[PDB]
Write a protein that binds this ligand. Structure first.
Ligand SMILES: CCCCCCCCCCCCC/C=C/[C@H](O)[C@H](N)CO
Lengths: 51, 287, 246, 51, 246
């Protein structure tokens, strides 16, 4: 945290093109549930999977 | 309800932007009030002050206190290492690795060892010259090889592809390279003193080589080459200067009076102990 | 209301009629690990009164040539009581300590003892060898003395290569035989990590040293011991497994 | 003091990282009472320490 | 809150751990001369911290046959420090004093000292001669001893022909080696005129006498000194001229 009044500037671009710029803007998005649990019928952690 | 027995710091902080002032104090003739007498057996220092010992004037004190903070004290670059790259004729490796230990050079070592725990950032500058001194227009590679990463086996070996390892490409004729490094310890602070062993097991009483070596300080290796195919004939040293910035420090400890011997060990001479203060002719002659 | 103190911890208690205040190291009390600083997910164990209490080592006897002794903590307690057992079955230890040192003599005796608490106290090989191969190192029985304590070869440089005169940076107190017969320091948990292994790592050593030597005129008592009593304030243990003594 | 309208700028950072920046923001905080006088019972300068 | 005292005057200060109150002679503090009592028109000088401060004479050593010593004030201070210089260049002196006497010994010693302050203390010739011609008188080195002090030939009659037992009319105190190691009296300026010559006239003498003799059993310390430390509270000087030592 901290960094009071550090006036950061990075993403400013000197060219008319978008791909000339510098990464990132980051991303915090995740969706593990599509790779880890890609099943039709949802299964709870309490219940046994197969009944 | 049925079983009842189941059911801070005194010191505070104050901003000090200048040296302390002095208030006027007159004499005192009376009993019961004794600022001079102290008892040091409590481990606390005498709190007696200028103003209760003598008669003083008033001094507004604008002397600055600022330069002595641990930030300003520790932010200076000083030599943490030297790397010798032959690359020349005869036996030729073509590269040199330097394990990163900043305890190798005494002058910056004694400042750090005033403290047990330290958490900081770093600014490394790489000043490379030739054997005597000069700069030719040769391209260089400074690569960081973190723990577990493959160390390069040759001048041209594949570990220099550095698809991941950070590397710096620089010409000997360019101003010295410089980078910022974070706090990489897997613990919460660096520690220059570790009383303990890294692993379990039975420890030899004859020779303990593992005593006192903290795992948390192992930062990987620094490796140099000359970017090229055949070889150069030159021979060069790289000097490595580390600056500490954003530094915090904990638990101050005494400053070392004995000559250092080894990087990683506080070994000193059982013979030959040097006194901390030079000797005079008699205790009754101040000079 | 000062020189008389009583300390009660667990089923144990200590009285002293001659005492110089009490030192609270670095201005903090021992405490349990806060949820924000903690890392290991499993639930620690907190025995309270069975671990936290005064254990009393054997007494070190006090002579004119004595160079001074040291101990390591928790190491002195790893074989004793329920504190020694928990530290063997758990991989993760945290706590503070309350240290108490008893030395008494009579108004015709004299001397002074420096009692200090040294975080990360590293002993040092003694020799002129500058090669890390041929260079000497201390033995395990030296690095970690146990209950029996160890002794200084060079008490002036504190065996670590550092001057004794500057030891007054650590939380300390003096036993000055004309003034007080005990020294008490309350040490918080200090370490760069919240938990650690009691077996592999000792947080801090204790040090008793004769800055001014013992003197008594003939006919008085020659036998002066130095007794040590230490209590583990606020203990936690984690990572339960089988027993490992070392 | 002085330095009227000197328009100082230092802490401005050109990178997306906090450790790339330059010291300090200083600090004026002190607490000598923890090292110098770390005793339970507080002792005044007037009174004698031991009574 | 009684037996422990500190006195701070000027750049000097005195601590004592064993003391019996403090005597303020005749219930007054020293003070500067009020405009109504003053006579001389010229402006006095008031150095404050350079004159007013504790000066310490040599120590008088304490024996079984000792009959006791005396000093004269300001006379003891006329050659010392900046106080001695001002008193030589000025014809008119006024001030008070704070007197402090240090004698210590050990719980196996015993004795008592009478410490008194005698305004207008006149020594006396010793002889049977009733003719003012043939009658003896004391010498200047006796009347005004200086720093070196003087001694009593007849301590019982105080060398003035007056019984010692009634000396308790003057501001006094005792040093009783089982009770206190110091005696302190704060003397106001006393005289029949507001200013006077420090050189020609001594306001009052100090007196230390063994009413009960020193005793110690063999093997204890034979050497006991008596040290004297005196400070000139509230000093004034007038009538500036060249320097006259006498
Ligand atoms: C492009 C090359 C960059 C080189 C980056 C190297 C950064 C390494 C981290 C340095 C942090 C301080 C070093 C660690 C402390 C002491 O050396 C320990 N005693 C090591 O044993």
């Amino acid at each position: 945290a901290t960094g009071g009044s550090t006036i950061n500037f990075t993403n400013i671009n000197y060219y008319k093109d978008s791909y000339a710029a510098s990464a990132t803007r980051q991303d915090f998005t995740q969706d593990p549930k599509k790779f880890t649990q890609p099943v039709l019928d949802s299964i709870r952690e309490l219940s046994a999977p197969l009944n | 309800d049925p079983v009842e027995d189941i059911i801070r710091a005194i010191s505070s902080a104050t901003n000090v932007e200048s040296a302390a002032n002095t208030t006027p104090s007159s004499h005192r003739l009376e009993t019961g009030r004794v600022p001079a007498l102290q008892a040091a057996e409590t481990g606390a220092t005498s709190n007696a002050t200028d103003e209760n010992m003598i008669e003083t004037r008033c001094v507004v004190n604008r002397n600055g206190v600022l330069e002595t903070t641990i930030n300003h004290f520790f932010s200076r670059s000083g030599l943490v290492g030297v790397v010798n790259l032959t690359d020349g004729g005869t036996d030729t490796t073509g590269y040199v690795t330097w394990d990163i230990d900043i305890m190798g050079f005494v002058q910056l070592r004694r400042k750090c060892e005033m403290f047990t725990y330290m958490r900081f950032n770093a600014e490394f500058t790489f000043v490379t010259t030739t054997k005597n001194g000069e700069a030719r227009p040769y391209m260089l590679q400074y690569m960081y090889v973190p723990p577990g990463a493959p160390k390069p086996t040759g001048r041209d070996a594949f570990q220099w592809q550095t698809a991941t390892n950070p590397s710096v490409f620089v010409k000997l004729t360019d101003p010295p390279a410089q980078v910022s490094v974070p706090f990489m310890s897997p613990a919460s602070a660096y520690q220059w003193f570790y009383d303990g062993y890294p692993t379990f097991g039975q420890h030899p009483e004859t020779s303990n080589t593992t005593y006192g070596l903290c795992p948390n300080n192992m930062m990987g290796t620094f490796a140099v080459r000359v970017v090229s195919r055949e070889a150069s004939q030159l021979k060069l040293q790289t000097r490595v200067y580390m600056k500490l910035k954003h530094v915090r420090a904990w638990v101050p400890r005494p400053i070392r009076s004995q000559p250092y011997l080894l990087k990683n060990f506080p070994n000193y001479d059982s013979s030959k102990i040097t006194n901390s203060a030079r000797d005079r002719s008699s205790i009754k002659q101040a000079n | 209301s000062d020189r008389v103190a009583q300390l009660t911890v667990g089923n144990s208690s200590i009285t002293t009629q001659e005492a110089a205040n009490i030192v609270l190291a670095y201005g903090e009390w021992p405490e349990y690990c806060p949820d924000t600083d903690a890392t290991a997910v499993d639930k620690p164990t907190r025995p309270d009164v069975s671990v936290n209490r005064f254990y009393t080592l054997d007494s070190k006897m006090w002579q004119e040539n004595s160079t001074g002794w040291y101990w390591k903590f928790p190491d002195v307690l790893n074989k004793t009581g329920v504190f020694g057992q928990n530290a063997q079955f758990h991989y993760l230890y945290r706590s503070g300590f309350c240290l108490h040192v008893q030395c008494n003599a009579s108004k015709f005796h004299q001397g002074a003892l420096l009692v200090a608490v040294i975080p990360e106290f590293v002993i040092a090989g003694r020799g002129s060898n500058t090669k890390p191969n041929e260079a000497p190192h201390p033995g395990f029985t030296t690095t970690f003395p146990g209950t029996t304590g160890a002794t200084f070869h060079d008490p002036y440089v504190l065996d670590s290569g550092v001057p004794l005169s500057q030891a007054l940076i650590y939380p300390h107190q003096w036993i000055n035989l004309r003034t007080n017969n005990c020294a008490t320091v309350i040490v918080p948990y200090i370490n760069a990590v919240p938990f650690d292994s009691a077996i592999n790592h000792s947080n801090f050593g204790l040090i008793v040293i004769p800055v001014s030597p013992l003197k008594y005129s003939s006919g008085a008592t020659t036998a002066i011991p130095i007794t040590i009593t230490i209590a583990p304030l606020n203990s936690e243990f984690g990572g339960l497994r089988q027993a490992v003594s070392q």
